[PDB]
Structure formats: structure tokens, C-alpha cells
Write an enzyme that holds these catalytic residues in place. Structure first.
Site, PDB file in Angstrom:
ATOM      1  N   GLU A 277       0.745  -1.163   0.077  1.00  0.00           N
ATOM      2  CA  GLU A 277      -0.060  -0.107   0.127  1.00  0.00           C
ATOM      3  C   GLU A 277       0.881   1.220  -0.001  1.00  0.00           C
ATOM      4  O   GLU A 277       0.717   2.292   0.828  1.00  0.00           O
ATOM      5  CB  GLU A 277      -1.097   0.150   1.308  1.00  0.00           C
ATOM      6  CG  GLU A 277      -1.965  -1.273   1.250  1.00  0.00           C
ATOM      7  CD  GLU A 277      -2.950  -0.984   1.953  1.00  0.00           C
ATOM      8  OE1 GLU A 277      -2.886  -0.427   3.192  1.00  0.00           O
ATOM      9  OE2 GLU A 277      -4.372  -1.515   1.922  1.00  0.00           O
TER      10      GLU A 277
ATOM     11  N   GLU B 262      -6.861  -6.791  -1.557  1.00  0.00           N
ATOM     12  CA  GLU B 262      -7.251  -6.953   0.101  1.00  0.00           C
ATOM     13  C   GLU B 262      -8.635  -6.250   0.273  1.00  0.00           C
ATOM     14  O   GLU B 262      -8.671  -4.865  -0.248  1.00  0.00           O
ATOM     15  CB  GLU B 262      -6.109  -6.265   0.656  1.00  0.00           C
ATOM     16  CG  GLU B 262      -6.044  -6.263   2.200  1.00  0.00           C
ATOM     17  CD  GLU B 262      -5.112  -5.434   2.600  1.00  0.00           C
ATOM     18  OE1 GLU B 262      -4.954  -4.949   3.920  1.00  0.00           O
ATOM     19  OE2 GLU B 262      -3.796  -5.373   2.267  1.00  0.00           O
TER      20      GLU B 262
END
Length: 373
Positions: free
Chosen positions: A160, A295
Site C-alpha cells: 500500500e 485486500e
């Protein structure tokens, strides 16, 4: 260079068992499962409460109806900080886990995760050169050690990456190019392997705003993009009310409270999910680039009670079904975020200690969403 070369055994290119394009490989994956809070845990694999990955866990994941696993992996804590050499024992441990997953006929996506933040929290001009050097050294080693696996194994360069503006996006583009170059440099099957590149913060809107290009690749049609999803945060992850907003306990048409209406969503319902996924269909999928939804999950609120808990659990199951179904209809590959926990504010659907299904309700929803049940 800051670090020595770890591209010490480059191999002739090999396409054996690597014949699928990115689009062809994507068509083989409808439901994935993250091995969360395990190989990426800071302090070691068991540090965050889960057991070491086992064959029995990977067999249960496959038997339960998943096609793939995403394996978050930590690296920096295993590396010599002077040389960037990753512990041989750790590289062998990751290789063993990949082998077990492939033995169970799973696709496998290995990354460098948050990893204590060395890259993830440092998408900055000041850290660009030193982070490119570590990205290159780490990926040379990871790729070399895992080079002989077939196309069941995919690599994801980052998790991320915290890029919030164009200046940071330019640094992230460099980190992604370094990843690709490092992998390809090792040759063998890594000449052909599908690689997965992360949008800024893996956030759909920031990706739509800031993303402009894939890295250059010597391979053709071997790249995918990755975004994550927690929308709306208030429902999926938020653990306490704040000045700026309230937890949602409920989500989904026909799973909303008639009594405690202030715990129903004020934004981020079905139409918003469709809207966000359409941005990625437009930008990537319908340009021939598959999207890994790497995710997503809405945590269990087992701190609720009675009818409120029943209603919460029914809408949570529906949220997972809706996200899975609407992702797949738009060419996003859904990978459920499982942190192993079975208690309040957790996302484990398996009891990892005993290798059993803890939450059949959420499992059923994911499989229904995938068209699997």
C-alpha cells in the site's frame, strides 16, 4: 552501488509452464485468500498470534473453494542492514510455503508488504535512491530464490505505497520500475512471470487521479494492477466513533436497522461500490490489464449483541458477497483479507490453531459471490 548485486545466477529465459498471458491467467482466479498477520508479521511469523503457515492450512483454503492465496511477506527485518542480504533461512522458509501452496494447486501472489514501512511509508524524493537500491537488492534475491516456480507464482512489488500526490506517484513509478527490472534481470521463468503493480495507497480514487503508466517490461502482456478496498471504512474497519463520524454496524439494502438508524451507512453503499469498481474497469480491465483486488474485508463486530448482532452479521455476509460478485463482474480478482483472528474486530474465517472453518456464514457469502455455491 549502496548494495552488492544479488543477480548472481541469471538464467536463460524459460517460458515452460509460463504460457498464459496476464488476461489468460486472471481468468483462472475467481476467489483468493490472504494469509494475513503471518509471514509479514514484525517480530517473526508467529509474532502476531497466528501459527506458522502449514500444509494443512493451505489444503483447507483450497478445499474450502479458494483458487489463490496472497501471501504478505516481510523482508527488511530478515536482512543485514549494511549489505541488504536477506537471511538464507528466511528465503528458504518462504520458498517452502510457496511450494506447499503450489502442491495444493493454488495460485500464489508473494509481495513485499508494509514491512515496517521502509518503502511503504517513504514514497519521497529524499528516500527515492536508497529505497530503489533496497527494492532492487531485495527483489533480485526473492526472484532468484523463487525463479523455478511456474506461472502459479506471481510477484507483487509493494503493498500500500503511501503516494498521495503527483510528486510521490513519480517516486512510486520508479519503485515499480525497479521491481520489474530486478525480477526480469534474473531470467529463467522470471523472464515471463506475471507481475502485479500497486496503485497509490492501493486506493481506487487516488489511482484514478494519479496513475499514468505501467513500468516498461521486456515481457509482453505480463502485468496486472492492484487496488485494495475498505469502502466504507466506517463499516469495514472503524473500531470507535470519532468527531468526524460514527461506526456503521449494518450494510446492504434489506440488512439496515429500523431501530438504531444512526448505525446504518450515510455513504458507501452498493451504488458507490459499483462506481468505484467501474473506474478500474475503465482504466485497466477494458484496456487489457487485469486488476487484482488484493485486500478487502469488513471485520466482525462480535462486541454487539442480540438482534443487532444477527443483523450486523447478515449485512456483513452480504457486503462480502456483493464486493466479490461486483468485482468479478468488472474484471477485478477478489482476495479476501484474513488476519487469522476469531474474536471481536477480526477477519479470520478459519480457526488457524485447529485448521477448521470458524465463520461459514462469510465463507458461504464469498463462494456465492464468486458463483461457486
Amino acid at each position: 552501488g549502496l548494495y552488492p548485486s544479488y543477480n548472481t545466477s541469471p538464467a536463460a529465459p524459460d517460458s515452460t509452464g509460463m504460457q498464459s498471458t496476464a488476461v489468460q491467467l486472471a481468468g483462472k482466479i475467481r476467489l483468493g485468500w490472504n494469509i494475513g498477520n503471518t509471514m509479514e508479521a514484525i517480530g517473526g511469523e508467529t509474532a502476531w498470534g497466528n501459527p506458522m503457515v502449514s500444509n494443512e492450512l493451505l489444503k483447507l483454503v483450497k478445499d474450502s473453494g479458494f483458487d489463490a492465496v496472497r501471501i504478505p511477506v516481510a523482508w527488511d527485518q530478515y536482512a543485514n542492514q549494511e549489505s541488504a542480504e536477506i537471511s538464507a533461512a528466511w528465503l528458504n522458509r518462504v520458498k517452502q510455503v510457496v511450494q506447499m501452496a503450489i502442491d495444493n494447486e493454488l495460485y500464489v501472489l508473494i509481495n513485499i508488504h508494509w514491512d515496517g514501512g521502509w518503502l511503504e511509508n517513504n514514497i519521497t524524493p529524499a528516500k527515492k535512491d536508497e529505497n530503489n537500491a533496497k527494492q532492487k537488492a531485495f527483489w533480485e534475491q526473492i526472484a532468484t530464490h523463487l525463479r523455478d516456480f511456474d506461472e502459479h507464482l506471481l510477484f507483487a512489488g509493494t503493498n500500500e505505497p503511501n503516494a498521495e500526490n503527483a510528486e510521490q506517484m513519480d517516486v512510486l513509478n520508479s519503485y515499480l520500475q525497479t521491481f520489474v527490472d530486478a525480477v526480469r534481470s534474473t531470467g529463467g521463468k522470471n523472464a515471463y512471470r506475471v507481475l502485479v503493480l500497486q496503485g497509490p495507497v492501493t486506493d481506487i480514487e487516488k489511482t484514478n487521479e494519479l496513475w499514468t503508466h505501467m513500468p516498461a517490461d521486456t515481457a509482453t502482456d505480463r502485468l496486472m494492477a492492484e487496488v485494495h478496498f475498505y469502502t466504507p471504512y466506517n463499516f469495514a474497519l472503524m473500531r470507535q466513533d470519532e468527531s468526524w463520524g460514527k461506526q456503521f454496524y449494518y450494510w446492504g439494502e434489506g440488512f439496515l436497522s429500523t431501530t438504531d438508524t444512526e448505525r446504518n451507512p450515510t455513504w458507501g453503499e452498493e451504488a458507490t461500490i459499483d462506481q468505484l469498481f467501474d473506474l478500474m474497469k475503465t482504466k485497466f480491465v477494458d484496456q487489457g490489464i487485469p486488476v487484482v483486488l488484493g485486500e478487502f474485508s469488513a471485520m466482525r463486530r462480535t462486541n454487539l449483541t442480540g438482534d443487532a448482532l444477527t443483523l450486523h452479521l447478515a449485512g456483513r455476509a452480504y457486503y462480502h458477497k456483493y464486493v466479490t460478485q461486483q468485482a468479478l463482474a468488472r474484471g477485478l480478482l477478489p482476495f479476501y483479507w484474513d488476519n487469522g483472528g476469531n474474536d471481536n474486530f477480526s477477519s479470520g474465517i478459519f480457526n488457524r490453531q485447529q485448521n477448521t472453518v470458524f465463520d461459514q456464514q462469510v465463507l458461504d457469502a464469498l463462494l456465492e459471490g464468486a458463483g461457486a455455491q
